[PDB]
UniProtKB/Swiss-Prot annotation, chain A:
It comes from the Eukaryota. The record marks R20, R29, R30 as: Important for interaction with integrin. This is Insulin-like growth factor II Ala-25 Del. It comes from Homo sapiens. Disulfide bonds join C5-C39, C17-C52, C38-C43.
From Swiss-Prot, chain B:
The chain holds residues 329 to 735 of 1367 of the full protein. Residues 163-274 form the Fibronectin type-III domain. The lineage of its organism: Eukaryota, Metazoa, Chordata, Craniata, Vertebrata. It comes from the Eukaryota. It comes from Homo sapiens. This is Insulin-like growth factor 1 receptor alpha chain. Disulfide bonds join C4-C25, C127-C160. Glycans are attached at N89, N110, N206, N273.
């Protein structure tokens, strides 16, 4: 997949993160958007575990 | 054929009524101007009053002529003679033509320019990739140089390369057509907002999109099941008759310009067996224009990666 | 409890028990991605009554109605916003109806309620009673109009000219839009609709006792709503008054003009003689080269920046009066050191709000070396460049295109006061599309 952006982005994210759940912390933090990282630019389907808790 | 001499060095044409005098002129020993601001169906009648015009001894100028998407009404043209090569020594000149989509320059017809180069500016919808063909076919292959035909505004908003839609399946009756096409995924699936389907009665194949708009327009929306490739019912068509059909994708030509791709079918001809609205340009666009960006913001904000 | 600094809730309903003690949230609330959809009606939070910032719900796939969660949620002050919106309710794939039936004021932002697959009871509730400026609301794409059959019981309910309708108003099939009669005028009211103290916002446990308010239409202090903070008490986080015992003991602060604040504003600075002294510049940072601006949320990040050492983009598709806020955040910007660009900003009539902008240094440029650029601004009738006020471009070209309502004489007058003729073609500042339809 070259790019992913909409509902299918939150679906593929829920699929990869599964039941571990998403990480979140207060912006306290960097101003770089996942969408620029994976919809405009060519996305990496192995990165999107990096958003999940561990 | 008949030669015409006209009293001005240049006959301006402002209207059908002023073209009317040239009706049945074939060889026009003068310059021409076209300055056609507004008016209905005009191109259909200008082919009658001028389409036989094939040899222009002067220059030819077109200006402000926002009425004209297509030059197809100058059917046959063969010669422009350069006897009045302009400043820069130009003999064909089109300027500020804020709707010009298509020259006559097409597989069916060649041209000759005897002398005097070509000029183009502020033609926002005439793709800069189209004219490269026209200047070669006209024989002026390398006479022009960079600034003589600017690249900046000409065709600046035009969809100058389109993906191809495939007709997947077709069906017909003695008065109906049903037709389908592959699920066009644009690169970012929100970018598509709808499909437009055009059809017209076209008993001979010598047809193009730009035939004046005589194209019946149909608006059809992608069914929300992403497993269904789209299709339409076309109904109440003439029996025992050929119809022509083609499809253009509707896409948000913003954010990325030419990386918003645009898509078009080839033309399809069908023999049958023996409404439009004004504002939907925006009033639909609005509801993806101002929803896609909010989604992109929400996704940028809500997710944050671990270290 | 006065919870904070802000609540982000995701993954599971079982984390939601963190709300069991909160009654005011000094921050946003997020409820996100609760994909299990299962626990549903195991949870309640009647303690909660005011949210000082926006509320975001996203894909909470299990939930029928928020009135099961937040029956009393009475004010959403909106002191921060989420893309102009103070409430967002998005892709609630099972949400039938809002509830929130006690909700009685939204004190700043608009609403965006969108895509909700099953949401009845949209706009059968007078948003002009609950908030000003209904024209900023954006209710779109939900369950389409004819499919619901929105009702109140017996419909026998509280009513109004719902816009140019005349109808019963209904939060949900069980509950009217509980409303305080016009006899109250500007006042709120208690149960039995008796009009309360003019510092109450929303309901009130007893009539016209200042202690009785639920929430305060100006400030809260020591259990009483008050129109302004007492002597020696500082306004904090836009709803409560505090003293040095708090503001000194917020984790890494300063005090100024009776605000308690994270830093001294423009024209004031730390004096180390004592850390309270914001003694009489302010620089915004960068990380993207392109600090795009699109909403009050992205503009609020500039609030009181004097020197913006980056490049702007402006993109304001919608928003009836947003310039009134953008002046408040951005009008203090005297310098942009990069380029500037404007795009598709169909809401702007004028740059007037860029109040004190002096300079555009063009340290960084567009392709084509444009240090300023203006495209497709279908309503920008006016530049802020009235000759009273200077604007100096210290390098590089201008560009202008497709500004249909902007008279060329105006952009030429700018060419005069910027003195900047010797840098552009016919195209870059053309008549042939800029102002072509200007009245
Ligand atoms: C196309 O073919 C038809 C023959 O059916 C002919 O009458 C017509 O002149 C041709 N050209 C155009 C432009 O239709
Ligand atoms: C709520 O407050 C009570 C009383 O102090 C305490 O026992 C309980 O643990 C608190 N729970 C949470 C989640 O804060
Ligand atoms: C909400 O409260 C604010 C307080 O400033 C007020 O301006 C606004 O008009 C109120 N709206 C309603 C509907 O009470
Ligand atoms: C245009 O911008 C680039 C980068 O700032 C600069 O190096 C160049 O000298 C400028 N002038 C041109 C390209 O004429």
């Amino acid at each position: 997949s070259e790019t992913l952006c909409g509902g299918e982005l939150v679906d593929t994210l829920q699929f990869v993160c599964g039941d571990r759940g998403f990480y979140f912390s207060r912006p306290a933090r960097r101003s770089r958007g996942i969408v620029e990282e994976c919809c405009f630019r060519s996305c990496d389907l192995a990165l999107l575990e990096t958003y999940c808790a561990t | 054929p008949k030669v015409c001499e006209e009293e001005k060095k240049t006959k301006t044409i402002d209207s059908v009524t002023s073209a009317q005098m040239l009706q049945g002129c074939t060889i026009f020993k003068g310059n021409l101007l076209i300055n056609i601001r507004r008016g209905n169906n005009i191109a259909s009648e200008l082919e009658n009053f001028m389409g036989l015009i094939e040899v222009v001894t002067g220059y030819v100028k077109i200006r402000h002529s926002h009425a004209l998407v297509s030059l197809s009404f100058l059917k046959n043209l063969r010669l422009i003679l350069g006897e009045e090569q302009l400043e820069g020594n130009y003999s064909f000149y089109v300027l500020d033509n804020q709707n010009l989509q298509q020259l006559w320059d097409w597989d069916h017809r060649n041209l000759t320019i005897k002398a005097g180069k070509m000029y183009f500016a502020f033609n926002p919808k005439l793709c800069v990739s189209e004219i490269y063909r026209m200047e070669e076919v006209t024989g002026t292959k390398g006479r022009q140089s960079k600034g003589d035909i600017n690249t900046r505004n000409n065709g600046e908003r035009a969809s100058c390369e389109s993906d191809v839609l495939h007709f997947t399946s077709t069906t017909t009756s003695k008065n109906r057509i049903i037709i389908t096409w592959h699920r066009y995924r644009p690169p970012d699936y929100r970018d598509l907002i709808s499909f437009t389907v055009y059809y017209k009665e076209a008993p001979f194949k010598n047809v193009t999109e730009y035939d004046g708009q005589s194209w019946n327009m149909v608006d059809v929306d992608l069914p929300p099941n992403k497993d269904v490739e789209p299709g339409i019912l076309l109904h109440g068509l003439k029996p025992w008759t050929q119809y022509a059909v083609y499809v253009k994708a509707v896409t948000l030509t913003m954010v990325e310009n030419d990386h918003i791709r645009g898509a078009k079918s080839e033309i399809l001809y069908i023999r049958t067996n023996a409404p439009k609205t004004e504002a939907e340009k925006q009033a639909e666009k609005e509801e993806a224009e101002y929803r896609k960006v909010f989604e992109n913001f929400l996704h940028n904000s809500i997710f944050v990666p671990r270290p």
